[PDB]
Symmetry: D2
Subunit: 120 residues, 4 copies
């Protein structure tokens, strides 16, 4: 299932637990950006997905502050878990930095990450 | 500043508690009990005091005890304080799909939340 | 109609002609970023929209190179024209910079611009 | 290196010409290539990219109307071209459908496409 240790295409490590209530909890370690060591993540997933072959919708957030660094920014990943021999979580993400109003136009980066339970 | 009730531009409301450890927890109401959903996210608990906003994000999976849309939305944005406080966000809404339909799985948009209806 | 001079919420100037064949042509002047004066734009729009009250889908691109500056980047706006007493073009945009492979993860900004024929 | 035929991860094809001063013009079609699947594309690219190893920024639009069909929608692709023996155009896209104002919240899909010179 969703619970386990995942890696994206760039080597970031996503350690997550999916609870019966639809909760996601865990830690994220980023291979890119103004980040070091582990950061808390929380999110939600559909705990009763369809039975027609569709994936399981989910999302989570990391605020890029821990006991060692603060980048004044947060990323959300939105996507779906696809089961099978090679389980996969396919996502698109938004990374918003705190900015002044004059700089808000350049506050948000966008991209896509794919996660598997094997390293890239 | 973040803790409390917020209203978007389209008739949605949420109530959130911003914890001292960076947690966001609360309830999102898209329009009655049947429209209330759990929300969970994170925010920068030590933002700059230089005029910059406070970065944050949260997720709602659209399942409750009454309904299930097999989908989830994430909002990514920043809180801006003061007399006209705002949470300015962009969002991604992913639906569970088959592989053949995955190309059309994700909608994108924006929401602005205020403390006054 | 779409043809005319439009302004976004930041005061950028969008001068566009919508041709009978679905073509958009014109110039863009940005209120923000590494930009000076007018840049070429081209795009497309639905020249026969639905008659059920729906807006008119459209999109356009600016590469941020002109005779004065080159930011090595390009923005695409995707949206729809909404007729009314206060005509409006509502868009979401992607701004991709040319980067190295190691920096590609942070190559693309995302935002939303709304245009009217009156300057705010 | 941009001019020619490109193929995405899901079968789609485009034939583009990159003009000297930054114009992109061409046709976007399905893998089958029948006339009913072909649409005009136009866009722009950086005609003087950096020389430090960075990609070439570009974008283009297709409105999904041709002489045969009209889906009342348009897609923009924003990305960069990377040359070499394994040349690529790496993009993210936005697909906006015409909607009423009440449905505007669900008007815009987002995704990503990677284009290569071989199928």
């Amino acid at each position: 299932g969703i619970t386990g240790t995942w890696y994206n295409q760039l080597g970031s490590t996503f350690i997550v637990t999916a609870g019966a209530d639809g909760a996601l909890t865990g830690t994220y370690e980023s291979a890119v950006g103004n980040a070091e060591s582990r950061y808390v993540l929380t999110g939600r997933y559909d705990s009763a997905p369809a039975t027609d072959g569709s994936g399981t919708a989910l999302g989570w957030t990391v605020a890029w502050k821990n006991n060692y660094r603060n980048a004044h920014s947060a990323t959300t990943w939105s996507g779906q878990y696809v089961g099978g021999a090679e389980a996969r979580i396919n996502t698109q993400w938004l990374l918003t930095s705190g900015t002044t109003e004059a700089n808000a136009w350049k506050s948000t980066l966008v991209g896509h990450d794919t996660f598997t339970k094997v390293k890239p």
